[PDB]
Design a protein around this nucleic acid. Structure first.
Ligand SMILES: [Mg+2]
Ligand SMILES: [Mg+2]
Ligand SMILES: [Mg+2]
Ligand SMILES: [Mg+2]
Ligand SMILES: [Mg+2]
Ligand SMILES: [Mg+2]
Ligand SMILES: [Mg+2]
Ligand SMILES: [Mg+2]
Ligand SMILES: [Mg+2]
Ligand SMILES: [Mg+2]
Ligand SMILES: [Mg+2]
Ligand SMILES: [Mg+2]
Ligand SMILES: [Mg+2]
Ligand SMILES: [Mg+2]
Ligand SMILES: [Mg+2]
Ligand SMILES: [Mg+2]
Ligand SMILES: [Mg+2]
Ligand SMILES: [Mg+2]
Ligand SMILES: [Mg+2]
Ligand SMILES: [Mg+2]
Ligand SMILES: [Mg+2]
Ligand SMILES: [Mg+2]
Ligand SMILES: [Mg+2]
Ligand SMILES: [Mg+2]
Ligand SMILES: [Mg+2]
Ligand SMILES: [Mg+2]
Lengths: 122, 129, 205, 82, 156, 80
RNA sequence: UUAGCUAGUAGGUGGGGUAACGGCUCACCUAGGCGACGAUCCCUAGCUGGUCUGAGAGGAUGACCAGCCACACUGGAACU
RNA sequence: UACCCGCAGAAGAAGCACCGGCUAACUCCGUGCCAGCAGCCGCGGUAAUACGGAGGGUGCAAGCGUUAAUCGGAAUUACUGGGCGUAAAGCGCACGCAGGCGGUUUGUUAAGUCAGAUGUGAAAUCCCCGGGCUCAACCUGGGAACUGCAUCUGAUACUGG
């Protein structure tokens, strides 16, 4: 790494890829759910996480985790995915924006309500 | 081979001081005479002495204080692979004023403090810290 | 743009008295100042590094009533000026207007000073100032206006202030309800519990 | 032609016109050969409101540069304030 | 008089025939508030016994740092066996810009205006021993005057 | 006085036109090592007095052809 | 993980043309020129003053504002 | 219209995220590898400070968050500023063109280098003093900077010829 070696062959920069490639640098892209199905995660956890397999707006086909405690999602219904890797489901990188545009919020949740789309209680 | 006589001189000073020599010796030259003159002026050697008619040996008598070395660190700046020519505002100030930096200016070889008081840059040969 | 909560929760949370109430009553008699506020308030952990810098910053913020982006702009201006950074930050927070009204004693506390300023009652150089965050300058008069000259709470606040100790970088003549910011204060004239290297380290993280 | 005119650099309800020796066929805020002075319309009391380098202005008027209406009135105002 | 700051309390483990044996160490620095520091490393079976032993080992074998008013005398690099580190003098009154263990050892050391940066690995042990090395190899201009055989205004 | 350069000669195989390798000495914009870069100029000349190895002083003129815009003012070191 | 490219192509002389030099355009001749200091080829891109970040060297980027370039349904051509 | 003046009443005006460590902020109740949280380490299998609810608090505040995107931290592309025995890394070894670097003395040249001046780096922005909009954002005067380029004039230590 002398300066003659540097001008003969330059110091190559450190480029790297985005971990959410299907969003196309859009913060929320709108997907149509083709499937909604449960999967048990990879060990040492054990549950039945709900992954909705959506076809995005730009032709991409990705599954995406569903948050909250329970849901209402079927197929044929447009939702918004927002990125963010769920650690324990192998090969799922997106969450669904709970509250957005067909997927209503959790039932009777009182705290953290903006993250799950629930109006103020009176 | 001997691709840097000035770094030969500086490495000999650093080695002799870190190995507790008293009178180190090297082959002489005009730039070595000028740099050793700067060091004897500022007080990083006791006295230098160039002996020899056709090809001489320059001898440097090293200083000590309480056993420890006097030159704490000494290094090149403008090595021959990559030379460092510096303008007057972009001059160094090694060790926040304490150490000296030898600059060859148009008016011979002189310490960077004298270079700032004469108002011209040059080439930085060493950072006697 | 303010904090409208129970003020002794702030005073009890820091532990030091923030000069948040008047002084007719002893504030240790007013609140249970010994324990911390909340339920688990008899617990005192070995307070961490983020904790100790946050506690010094929040003590200054809740003494002077200044919110966070206002404080961050005061820090940016303080580090931007010449001289010592903490000295300049305390100089700017002292050169706020409602702090000047509290030091001259026209309002009871700093919050009452904020209400007195904000309700159109202070004349800096004979000019109405409607804003609690006016910056005052050296050699500058500051006076109460004529529709506020009759208010009983001003002379009650005056008797409370001249019961308290006086600030030394000001001139006051309360028989006119006025005074003058004679010189910008120093670090030495202020209090010593307010520390400064913690604030400059927290906003230079 | 090249004119000496006024470009309105300011904010809402409170303009501030800087005079420019600019081309005719450019924009108002566009390029200019040389900037000479300014005129603050809502400039207050006890201060200076208008400042024009009459040396460079008369140099350009000799050089063939015309005048504008408002800066003509302003040059008359400066030489009257003399 | 001497103010002391703990830095870290680690939980080392030695594996024997029965099982693991959990011990606790302690890395506490102590100093006067000026150029006199001593770090200390203690290690015992329970925590306050370890930190008291660390405080004794720091309360002796201290250092002698000559100083300016509250700031260093030159930029220093200091390396010791995990880490090289770089700490720099600052203007008057600008906060101890460091962190982790450098912050604790410098605010105990009574420097008050520094600019530091920890390169390499940053274990608390390694970086406090390297910071102590940096404060060692820092020297006063009166010391450099006596050393070089000049006067302090001749160095300027 | 005239802004004129000096460089060597690569070749002269075509007529009334030489090509000149000006090796100007530049600082490198990041690493600071003074590397050399030789720029070639198609230089016009009359009667073809120059050949490979000549050291020519040249000035810029009106463009004599498509890629040739420099004519010479004096010629030193004619041979090897 | 593109090493060859270039036939008006590199230059000359003569004619023509242009507001103006010039293969800009022709006739004839010379056989050249470009290339590992990256030619040619592929993919992406308006550029700059700047903006964001950074202690700094730099990294990313070109919204508003200002300068320059290009285009006006797509592809051309000329007139005034 | 800016702004000033008069009216009557505390009336018309506070939310969002978080609380296991990193990270400021803890206890009870409902669950029981279920429901779920997750930015990483990991939580949940019958006393869950990590899931859901309450109480309390902490942080921001007319905003608060989640996502996307850049830089920093990343000295994790290192010129300033890394490394090569064993962690990833010395071509299997030599010859050698181009390229890079070149002992020592003198003389000249002055290309690189340095220094002064000239032209220039549009204005806006950035920054330093200042002025105004009651304050600030914002608007604006003067100044340096515009780390460059070119030209003239010098100096000769280093490097080059
Ligand atoms: Mg606000
Ligand atoms: Mg300061
Ligand atoms: Mg590391
Ligand atoms: Mg022709
Ligand atoms: Mg003709
Ligand atoms: Mg950085
Ligand atoms: Mg067109
Ligand atoms: Mg068309
Ligand atoms: Mg929360
Ligand atoms: Mg905590
Ligand atoms: Mg949560
Ligand atoms: Mg169990
Ligand atoms: Mg339970
Ligand atoms: Mg959590
Ligand atoms: Mg980096
Ligand atoms: Mg990153
Ligand atoms: Mg490494
Ligand atoms: Mg191995
Ligand atoms: Mg290996
Ligand atoms: Mg080998
Ligand atoms: Mg060999
Ligand atoms: Mg040589
Ligand atoms: Mg020269
Ligand atoms: Mg400009
Ligand atoms: Mg003002
Ligand atoms: Mg020479």
């Amino acid at each position: 790494a002398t300066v003659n070696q540097l001008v003969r062959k330059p110091r190559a920069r450190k480029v790297a890829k985005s971990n959410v490639p299907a969003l196309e640098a859009c913060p929320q892209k709108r997907g149509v759910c083709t499937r909604v199905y449960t999967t048990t995660p990879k060990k040492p956890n054990s549950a039945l996480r709900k992954v909705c397999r959506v076809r995005l707006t730009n032709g991409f086909e990705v599954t995406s985790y569903i948050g909250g405690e329970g849901h209402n999602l079927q197929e044929h219904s447009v939702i918004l995915i927002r990125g963010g890797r769920v650690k324990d489901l192998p090969g799922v990188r997106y969450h669904t924006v709970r509250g957005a545009l067909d997927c209503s919020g959790v039932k009777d949740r009182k705290q953290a309500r903006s993250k799950y789309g629930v109006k103020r209680p009176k | 081979s001997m691709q840097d006589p000035i770094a030969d001189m500086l490495t000999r000073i650093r080695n002799g001081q870190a190995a507790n020599k008293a009178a180190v010796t090297m082959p002489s030259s005009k730039l070595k005479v000028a740099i050793a003159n700067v060091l004897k002026e500022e007080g990083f050697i006791e006295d230098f002495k160039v002996e020899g008619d056709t090809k001489p040996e320059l001898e440097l008598t090293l200083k000590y204080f309480q056993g420890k070395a006097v030159v704490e660190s000494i290094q090149r700046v403008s090595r021959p692979g990559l030379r460092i020519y510096k303008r007057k505002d972009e001059l160094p100030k090694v060790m926040a004023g304490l150490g000296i930096a030898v600059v060859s200016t148009s008016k011979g070889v002189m310490t960077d403090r004298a270079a700032r008081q004469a108002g011209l840059g040059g080439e930085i040969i060493c950072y006697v810290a | 743009a303010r904090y409208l909560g129970p003020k002794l929760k702030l005073s009890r949370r820091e532990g030091t008295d923030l000069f948040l109430k008047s002084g007719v009553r002893a504030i240790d008699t007013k609140c249970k100042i010994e324990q911390a506020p909340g339920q688990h308030g008899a617990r005192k952990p070995r307070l961490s590094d983020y904790g100790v810098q946050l506690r010094e910053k929040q003590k200054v913020r809740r003494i002077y009533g200044v919110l966070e982006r206002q404080f961050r702009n005061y820090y940016k201006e303080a580090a931007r000026l010449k001289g010592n950074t903490g000295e300049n930050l305390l100089a700017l927070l002292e050169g706020r207007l409602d702090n000047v009204v509290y030091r001259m004693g026209f309002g009871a506390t700093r919050a009452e000073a904020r209400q007195l300023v904000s309700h159109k009652a202070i004349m800096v150089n004979g000019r109405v100032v409607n804003i609690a965050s006016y910056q005052v300058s050296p050699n500058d008069v500051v006076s109460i206006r004529e529709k506020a000259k009759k208010q009983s709470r001003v002379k009650a606040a005056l008797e409370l202030a001249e019961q308290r100790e006086k600030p030394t970088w000001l001139e006051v003549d309360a028989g006119k309800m006025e005074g003058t910011f004679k010189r910008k204060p120093e670090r030495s004239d202020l209090s010593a519990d307010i520390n400064e290297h913690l604030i400059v380290e927290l906003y230079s993280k | 032609m090249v004119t000496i005119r006024l470009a309105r650099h300011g904010a809402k309800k409170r303009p501030f016109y800087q005079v420019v020796v600019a081309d005719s066929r450019n924009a108002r805020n566009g390029r200019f050969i040389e900037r000479v002075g300014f005129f603050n319309p809502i400039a207050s009391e006890k201060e200076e409101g208008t400042r024009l380098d009459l040396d460079r202005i008369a140099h350009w008027v000799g050089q063939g540069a015309t005048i504008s209406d408002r800066v003509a009135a302003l040059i008359k105002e400066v030489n009257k304030a003399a | 008089e001497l103010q002391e700051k703990l830095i870290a309390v680690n939980r080392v483990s030695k594996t024997v025939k029965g099982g693991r044996i959990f011990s606790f160490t302690a890395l506490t620095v102590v100093g006067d508030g000026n150029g006199r520091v001593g770090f200390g490393y203690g290690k015992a079976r329970e925590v306050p016994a370890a930190i008291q032993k660390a405080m004794e080992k720091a309360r002796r074998n201290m250092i002698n740092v000559a100083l300016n008013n509250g700031t260093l005398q030159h930029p220093v690099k200091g390396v010791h066996t995990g880490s090289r580190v770089f700490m720099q003098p600052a203007s008057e009154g600008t906060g101890i810009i460091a962190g982790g263990a450098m912050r604790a050892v410098l605010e105990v050391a009574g420097v008050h205006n520094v600019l530091a940066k920890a390169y390499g690995s940053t274990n608390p042990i390694n970086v406090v021993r390297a910071t102590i090395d940096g404060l060692e190899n820092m020297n006063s201009p009166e010391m450099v005057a006596a050393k070089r055989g000049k006067s302090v205004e001749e160095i300027l | 006085k005239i802004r004129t350069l000096q460089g060597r000669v690569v070749s002269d195989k075509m007529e009334k036109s030489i090509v000149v390798a000006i090796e100007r000495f530049v600082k490198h914009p990041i690493y600071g090592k003074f590397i050399k870069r030789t720029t070639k100029l198609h230089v016009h000349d009359e009667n073809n007095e120059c050949g490979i190895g000549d050291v020519v002083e040249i000035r810029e003129c009106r463009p004599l052809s498509k890629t040739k815009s420099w004519t010479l003012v004096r010629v030193v070191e004619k041979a090897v």
